[PDB]
Design a binder for these strands. Structure first.
Lengths: 261, 261
DNA sequence: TCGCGAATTCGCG
DNA sequence: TCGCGAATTCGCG
């Protein structure tokens, strides 16, 4: 990539860092590009923080809490920057989910099912839980003009192209991506309003039906449709790209630090 | 309740009808109160319908579909009314979830856990999937001014008050609602922006940070905090109340049928 | 301690 | 057939 971004990317690939460790790498890269700015990484956000942010928007919001110390822990953590007013603004929130172990089963001679004779396993729906954290962060950033939520998908339940897997028997099992027996990719499309996947959807859209005005918060949904594992170098580039976009939208509240510092 | 609403409610209680069957009862009651209007019940909505509605709002929305015949099936179904333009407008969408079988375990002498010695089971997170359908219907009704989504919770994981359960041994197991070991009620609060639970939140709110304008779609989250099962009569009253509110917001597009018919 | 997250195996039309 | 939904048992700091 561009200058140091290529160097940081090679380090991510050399160690095959997890999403949480790649988020920490993104903060280092950001500190390197913008030395005048202050960045930090956080692994959790308590519900009391979200409610406080909700109350600032409307007094009747964020008035519910059953378990005092409730919180959310996105496996990728959170990256933030300090603005000219001394307040922390979120620049990135990452998450990585996995579902579908069919490629692993057919790579071997394992037959699944209640009878133990099926090549494929009927795909589940646990991936739907992803919407909770997306809704929590959206409420936390309801006053913001950007939504830097990145979700990485992996497994046999998120294919975007056909693949052929050869078993030890020699028989080639052919999987079709459009098969509703396995594809759960549509169980996530509501998160970004049906907008293109594998894209940076950080900048919020402002639609309107009939003189109304609404702000859409679309999450960036990236998938490895090949069936293979995610490459750490490409995860880093994607996450760094989304973080830079967050800074652009936040530009007006960071100016004094890039000049008067 | 008011007139016939009390009669329909007694019929629901006499048979202990499920949420899906109570939704059908609500359509009958609505047809009875508004004979000039046409109502219908639907058990499913395909993704092609949602995408079509999304495209009408913005041309770049609803442009993704991996499995041609994908759909959503809320266990409570959907109730709709026909407006003066011949188009169907959703008046109600119901759902009922269950989680936490601790009350059932301690009512007996059953000890759970990997060792088989715990009185309680560490609460799971499968209830988080609820956010998917809420997001789908919200996208389907993004042009509407109301959001009639009703979610009913039940189980030992959704307590709002303390309860004491006596086992066959005689020992009284005391459960505290604020205990994060069991309470999963906060895993749903994002759905209604922390607004009051057990309330009718059908009419959309219009907030704004700094000259922006946003429309909030909050789901009505009702829970049986006692730990007991839901009463069909009270489920019907709640659902009928939400349906009537939908008609009020839809008033301008139903006038010609109440007059010129 | 307490509170969050992994994601799976099948039943049902 | 194919495609959606139930919701659970524990590991981890």
């Amino acid at each position: 990539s561009q200058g140091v971004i290529g160097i940081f990317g090679d380090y991510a690939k050399a160690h095959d860092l997890a999403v949480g460790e790649v988020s920490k790498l993104v903060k280092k890269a950001l500190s390197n590009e913008y030395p005048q700015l202050s960045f930090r990484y956080r692994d959790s956000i308590k519900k009391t923080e979200i409610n406080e942010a909700l109350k600032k928007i409307d007094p009747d919001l964020g008035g519910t809490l059953f378990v005092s110390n409730s919180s959310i822990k996105p496996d990728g953590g959170i990256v933030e920057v300090k603005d000219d007013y001394g307040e922390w603004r979120v620049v990135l929130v990452a998450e990585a989910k996995h579902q579908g172990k069919d490629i692993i089963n057919i790579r071997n001679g394992l037959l699944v099912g209640k009878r133990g004779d099926q090549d494929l396993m009927a795909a589940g729906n646990a991936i739907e839980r992803s919407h909770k954290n997306i809704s929590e962060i959206a409420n936390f950033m309801l006053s913001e003009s950007h939504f830097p939520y990145v979700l990485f998908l992996e497994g046999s339940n998120f294919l975007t192209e056909n693949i052929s897997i050869t078993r030890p028997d020699g028989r080639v099992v052919n999987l079709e991506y459009n098969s509703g027996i396995l594809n759960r990719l549509d169980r996530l499309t509501a998160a970004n309003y049906g907008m293109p996947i594998n894209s940076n959807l950080c900048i919020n859209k402002f639609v309107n039906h009939k003189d109304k005005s609404i702000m859409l918060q679309a999450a960036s949904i990236y998938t490895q449709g090949d069936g293979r594992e995610w490459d750490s170098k490409i995860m880093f580039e994607i996450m760094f790209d989304i973080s830079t976009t967050s800074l652009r939208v936040l530009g007006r509240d960071l100016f004094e630090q890039l000049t008067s510092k």
